[PDB]
Write a protein that binds this ligand. Sequence first.
Ligand SMILES: CCCCCCCCCCCCCCCCOC[C@H](COCC(F)(F)F)OP(=O)(O)OC
Ligand SMILES: [Ca+2]
Ligand SMILES: [Ca+2]
Lengths: 124, 124
Amino acid sequence: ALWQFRSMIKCAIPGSHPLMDFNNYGCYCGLGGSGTPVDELDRCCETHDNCYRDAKNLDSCKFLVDNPYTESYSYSCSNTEITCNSKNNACEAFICNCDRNAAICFSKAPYNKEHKNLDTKKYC
Amino acid sequence: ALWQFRSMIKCAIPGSHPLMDFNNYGCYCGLGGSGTPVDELDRCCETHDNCYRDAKNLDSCKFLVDNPYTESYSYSCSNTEITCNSKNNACEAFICNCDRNAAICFSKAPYNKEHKNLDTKKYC
Ligand SMILES: CCCCCCCCCCCCCCCCOC[C@H](COCC(F)(F)F)OP(=O)(O)OC
Ligand SMILES: [Ca+2]
Ligand SMILES: [Ca+2]
């Protein structure tokens, strides 16, 4: 679920303000995303977006009947480390995995302040 | 901006995990929204959605081509009381007031556990 994805961003990036930081960044961090991603951080978001589309297509997720952000999973934070709990059923695990990789992705890419809050209609 | 709405809610509602309880609630607390709101709280979300639609059609917001969640404004919190700064220019003032109106509304509307994470495809 969305709140769990934010939780993971805070786990991976302890002092982060995930909504402040990564909503409205680039062409892809935010609802939707078109165009060429502007950088590594943006490409993380595009990957997340792709992953969710792939979850919606997943046979295991066939009873998912809204947005993967509405699907809860079980996860744990351990000293900066995220673990998708092994108990998760298949759809929950796949979506927890989407989020966890994006979280780790966020923590490794450079943050470029100028890429934040783009006029996506002119540049994406 | 959406991160500000998140802190507005934490202001009016001390307990609060905004993404956790208010997101994916009823037919209108979450993305889009169609259908008949399922309770007063759900109407708080419907009303905010409409405020945002208003915000995009408001002449003072004409240079805001994105979505109002990406518009930053200036606000304050004291004693669970929300302040939209006098120094907001008109769009920002409007959007801040949509967000303040909603957070207050959330704070007085009953939260009905059984309306959380509704099958919107089925029920909205
Ligand atoms: C202000 C707090 C909102 C939660 C309480 C209010 C209740 C109503 C909320 C209505 C729905 C608004 C939330 C919709 C946000 C959509 O989510 C889009 C998502 C936001 O990113 C969140 C993250 F922190 F993970 F970066 O962009 P995405 O590309 O998927 O990920 C980067
Ligand atoms: Ca996106
Ligand atoms: Ca909505």
